[PDB]
Antibody
Framework: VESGGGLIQPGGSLRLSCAVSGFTVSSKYMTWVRQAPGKGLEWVSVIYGGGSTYYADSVVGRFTISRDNSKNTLYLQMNSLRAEDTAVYYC???????????????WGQGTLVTVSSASTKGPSVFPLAPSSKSTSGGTAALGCLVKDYFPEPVTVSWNSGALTSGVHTFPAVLQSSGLYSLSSVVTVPSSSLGTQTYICNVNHKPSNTKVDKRVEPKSC | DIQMTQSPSTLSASVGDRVTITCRASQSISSWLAWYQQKPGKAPKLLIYDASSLESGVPSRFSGSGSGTEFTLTISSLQPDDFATYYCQQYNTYSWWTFGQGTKVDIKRTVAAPSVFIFPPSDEQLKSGTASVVCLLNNFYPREAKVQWKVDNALQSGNSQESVTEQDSKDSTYSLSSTLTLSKADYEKHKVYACEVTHQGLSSPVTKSFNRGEC
């Protein structure tokens, strides 16, 4: 599995490694392909069996691909990293020997790189209160906004796990601030809003944050 | 660079369907094109290369055709294992390979407009110096949905982010939350906060809004 990834501040450097067992790295072309969370595949760089190297515009001048045949390992030196380089990075190659130049039938497991200046920070847990604005056919929506935390992950439950159906805890988003945010919502019968309380439980182990937030209904 | 444009963005399908995805190149590339399959959290897998050659061990229900700029990937009878995202890739040039934006093949159901709800910031958050507004789109199909934020009629560009759930294993819908984030100070300077939603199940775009002071 690729390694050398992980967390790094903007302007910083990382060095990915892709150690391979099943074939020699130097008899083949090898490539790096990255994928931002929620996004598609972006080809990053290639090293051909003959030693030539090529780079996508977006990384040229910052990244260097290389291999050490002694250790049977491919590398990607990543310098001057920016937030937009946040992605899962895969090494890839082709094991079938054929006259073709560019298809990829071997892919590593992938390794996450996150580019953020953020330090560890516990979330603020804000209520998303039900009201007329969030009721429809006798069902009301409510939730919790779990904002500005770092790093991942957080866990969210409702009523300490007694309430699971109707719950949608959305994937977190890395904000332009370098902090994460997510929401968790649940739809319940509006007739229940006055007669029963809804609490979201947010745990963020890195910061030792454990918050229970009551989500009171609005009377408008 | 060569831009690869796939369509559709999501292909609705059922087990047994004959499914065809298209991929268009912005420059001619002969047959130098490959198709990949990818499931969430997993690495891609090669299906077809040189437009029409099967990677060995890939089921023969997968086929591809085209050469030049228009290419198709066909699954002749979709299997449960085939619900996934599919990417095309060109390697016409040694110097720069590019992928399409992907086509998600998901579980077909009837069209469902979202229920759209909007949540003003909590008074709680307002004391921290920031104000976030959330727009929830609940239980919609197909996946394509557009959220636009306006503050006193001004289009907001750069202070919002979106998150979507996986297809619901039970009702087969998606849900989406968008968060608009402003300073406390400018939040208290404006009045109307509006989430405009565009979705095929709506006859026209829907706007959910509130005035800051009211509830």
């Amino acid at each position: 599995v690729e390694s050398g990834g992980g967390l790094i501040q903007p302007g910083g450097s990382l060095r990915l490694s892709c150690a391979v067992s099943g074939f020699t790295v130097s008899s083949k072309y090898m490539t790096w392909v990255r994928q931002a969370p929620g996004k598609g595949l972006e080809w990053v760089s290639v090293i051909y069996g003959g030693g030539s190297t090529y780079y996508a515009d977006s990384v040229v001048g910052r990244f260097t691909i290389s291999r050490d045949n002694s250790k049977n390992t491919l590398y990607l030196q990543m310098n001057s990293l920016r937030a937009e380089d946040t992605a899962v990075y895969y090494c890839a190659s082709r094991l079938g020997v054929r006259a073709t130049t560019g298809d990829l039938d071997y892919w590593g497991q992938g390794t996450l790189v996150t580019v953020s200046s953020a330090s560890t920070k516990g979330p603020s847990v804000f209520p998303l209160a039900p009201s007329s604005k969030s009721t429809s056919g006798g069902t009301a929506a409510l939730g919790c906004l779990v904002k500005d935390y770092f790093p991942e992950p957080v866990t969210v439950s409702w009523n300490s796990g007694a309430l699971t159906s109707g719950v949608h805890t959305f994937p977190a988003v890395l904000q332009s601030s370098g902090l994460y945010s997510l929401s968790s919502v649940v739809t319940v019968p509006s007739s229940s809003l006055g007669t029963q309380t809804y609490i979201c439980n947010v745990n963020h182990k890195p910061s030792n944050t454990k918050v229970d937030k009551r989500v009171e209904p609005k009377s408008c | 660079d060569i831009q690869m444009t796939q369509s559709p963005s999501t292909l609705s399908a059922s087990v047994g369907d004959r499914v065809t995805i298209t991929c268009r190149a912005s420059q001619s590339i002969s047959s130098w094109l490959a198709w990949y399959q990818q499931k969430p959290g997993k690495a891609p897998k090669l299906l077809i290369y040189d437009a029409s050659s099967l990677e060995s061990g890939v089921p023969s229900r997968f086929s591809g055709s085209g050469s030049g700029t228009e290419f198709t990937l066909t699954i002749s009878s979709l299997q449960p294992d085939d619900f996934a995202t599919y990417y095309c890739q060109q390697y016409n040039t040694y110097s720069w390979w590019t992928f399409g934006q992907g086509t998600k093949v998901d579980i077909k159901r009837t069209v469902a407009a979202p229920s759209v709800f909007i949540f003003p910031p909590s008074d709680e958050q307002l004391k921290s110096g920031t104000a976030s507004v959330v727009c929830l789109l609940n239980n919609f199909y197909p996946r394509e949905a557009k959220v636009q934020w306006k503050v006193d009629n001004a289009l907001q560009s750069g202070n919002s982010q979106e998150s979507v759930t996986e297809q619901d294993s039970k009702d087969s819908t998606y849900s989406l939350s968008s968060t608009l984030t402003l300073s406390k100070a400018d939040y208290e300077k404006h009045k109307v906060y509006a989430c405009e939603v565009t979705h095929q199940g709506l006859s026209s775009p829907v706007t959910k809004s509130f005035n800051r002071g009211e509830c």
